[PDB]
Design a protein around this motif. Structure first.
Motif, short mmCIF file in Angstrom:
data_model
loop_
_atom_site.label_atom_id
_atom_site.label_comp_id
_atom_site.label_asym_id
_atom_site.label_seq_id
_atom_site.Cartn_x
_atom_site.Cartn_y
_atom_site.Cartn_z
N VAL A 191 70.36 63.83 52.02
CA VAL A 191 70.14 63.01 53.21
C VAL A 191 68.64 62.79 53.39
O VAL A 191 68.18 61.69 53.70
N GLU A 192 67.86 63.83 53.15
CA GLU A 192 66.41 63.69 53.30
C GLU A 192 65.86 62.66 52.32
O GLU A 192 64.92 61.92 52.65
N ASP A 193 66.42 62.60 51.11
CA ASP A 193 66.02 61.58 50.15
C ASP A 193 66.36 60.18 50.65
O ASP A 193 65.53 59.27 50.59
N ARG A 194 67.58 59.99 51.15
CA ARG A 194 67.92 58.68 51.71
C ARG A 194 66.93 58.27 52.81
O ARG A 194 66.55 57.09 52.92
N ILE A 195 66.58 59.20 53.68
CA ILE A 195 65.68 58.90 54.79
C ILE A 195 64.27 58.61 54.28
O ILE A 195 63.57 57.73 54.80
N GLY A 196 63.82 59.35 53.26
CA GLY A 196 62.49 59.11 52.71
C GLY A 196 62.32 57.69 52.21
O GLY A 196 61.32 57.03 52.48
N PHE A 197 63.31 57.19 51.47
CA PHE A 197 63.25 55.80 51.03
C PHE A 197 63.20 54.85 52.23
O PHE A 197 62.38 53.94 52.29
N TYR A 198 64.14 55.02 53.17
CA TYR A 198 64.20 54.14 54.31
C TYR A 198 62.88 54.11 55.08
O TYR A 198 62.42 53.04 55.48
N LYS A 199 62.27 55.28 55.30
CA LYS A 199 61.02 55.34 56.04
C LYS A 199 59.90 54.61 55.30
O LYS A 199 59.14 53.83 55.89
N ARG A 200 59.81 54.81 53.98
CA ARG A 200 58.77 54.12 53.22
C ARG A 200 58.98 52.61 53.29
O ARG A 200 58.03 51.85 53.45
N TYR A 201 60.23 52.16 53.18
CA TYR A 201 60.47 50.72 53.23
C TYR A 201 60.17 50.16 54.60
O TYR A 201 59.60 49.07 54.72
N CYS A 202 60.59 50.86 55.66
CA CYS A 202 60.28 50.41 57.00
C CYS A 202 58.78 50.34 57.19
O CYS A 202 58.27 49.40 57.80
N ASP A 203 58.05 51.34 56.66
CA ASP A 203 56.59 51.37 56.79
C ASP A 203 55.97 50.14 56.13
O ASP A 203 55.11 49.47 56.72
N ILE A 204 56.39 49.82 54.91
CA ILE A 204 55.82 48.69 54.19
C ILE A 204 56.23 47.37 54.83
O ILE A 204 55.43 46.44 54.90
N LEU A 205 57.48 47.28 55.36
CA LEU A 205 57.91 46.06 56.03
C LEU A 205 57.36 45.92 57.46
O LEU A 205 57.45 44.83 58.04
N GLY A 206 56.81 46.98 58.03
CA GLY A 206 56.24 46.89 59.37
C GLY A 206 57.27 46.94 60.47
O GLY A 206 57.15 46.20 61.47
N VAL A 207 58.26 47.81 60.36
CA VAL A 207 59.30 47.92 61.39
C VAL A 207 59.57 49.37 61.70
O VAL A 207 59.40 50.26 60.86
#
Length: 238
Positions: free
Chosen positions: A208-224
């Motif tokens: 689960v932590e891996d799934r969240i890590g990806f999501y957080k990085r993508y949200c960070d790069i997309l600005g959301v």
């Protein structure tokens, strides 16, 4: 919708020689697939549209990750590295008069959501217009079909269990039983939909932590912003 340069920044290492899926997961195949599901990434306001793409790419990146803790750009830059389940333990055949296993074929994990089992390849193919029960290998040979299988999963409810799409775009309102089970809208309930039987409702978990890590990085790069309720650690599985 994300641009090519953005797609390539999120999925920065997928075309490395280190990745078995090198060259397969093209931006053009992603955009073609998304055309079959026109509400994907187009539902809601600007933040919600970006968040849906971040959440879809985050979960699928986990299913296909080649990352490791000291990797270049960190482990959350190694999504979409794999195409086929590594060392599958069986044929993933559960014989069914509705879904009969094709002779010689195997239904191990393939593509961005690691579609598995004859009775998932069957209805998915039916929805796409392709015979995946009888040619499951298409999910690992045709990148448009491959992305379409993952979008099929994302967009299709198993009512009363909701689609991931409806959760992230705000179209799902939890039932009273859902609320009693801790299932509230957010990335966490999306993890629950995808693999909650094994990952949710049991405290912290490395998957689960891996799934969240990806999501957080993508949200960070997309600005959301990430939204609330990112984990499913306190949610009953569906």
């Amino acid at each position: 919708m994300i641009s090519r340069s953005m797609f390539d920044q999120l999925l920065k290492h997928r075309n490395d020689g280190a990745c078995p899926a090198k060259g397969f997961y093209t931006y053009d195949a992603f955009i073609a697939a998304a055309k079959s599901f026109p509400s994907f990434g187009t539902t809601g306001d600007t933040d919600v549209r970006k968040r849906e793409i971040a959440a879809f790419l985050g979960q699928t990146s986990h299913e296909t990750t080649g990352g490791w803790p000291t990797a270049p750009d960190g482990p959350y830059a190694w999504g979409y590295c794999f195409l086929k389940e590594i060392n599958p333990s069986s044929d993933y055949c559960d014989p069914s008069p509705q879904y009969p296993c094709a002779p010689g074929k195997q239904y191990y994990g393939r593509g961005p959501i690691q579609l598995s089992w004859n009775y998932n390849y069957g209805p998915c193919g039916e929805a796409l217009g392709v015979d995946l029960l009888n040619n499951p290998d298409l999910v690992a040979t045709d990148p448009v079909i491959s992305f379409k299988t993952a979008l099929w999963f994302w967009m299709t409810p198993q009512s009363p269990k909701p689609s991931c799409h409806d959760v992230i775009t705000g179209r799902w309102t939890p039932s009273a039983a859902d609320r009693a089970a801790g299932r509230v809208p957010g990335y966490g309930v999306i993890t629950n939909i995808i693999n909650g039987g094994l990952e949710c409702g049991k405290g912290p978990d490395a998957q689960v932590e891996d799934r969240i890590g990806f999501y957080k990085r993508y949200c960070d790069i997309l600005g959301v912003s990430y939204g609330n309720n990112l984990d499913c650690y306190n949610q009953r599985p569906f």
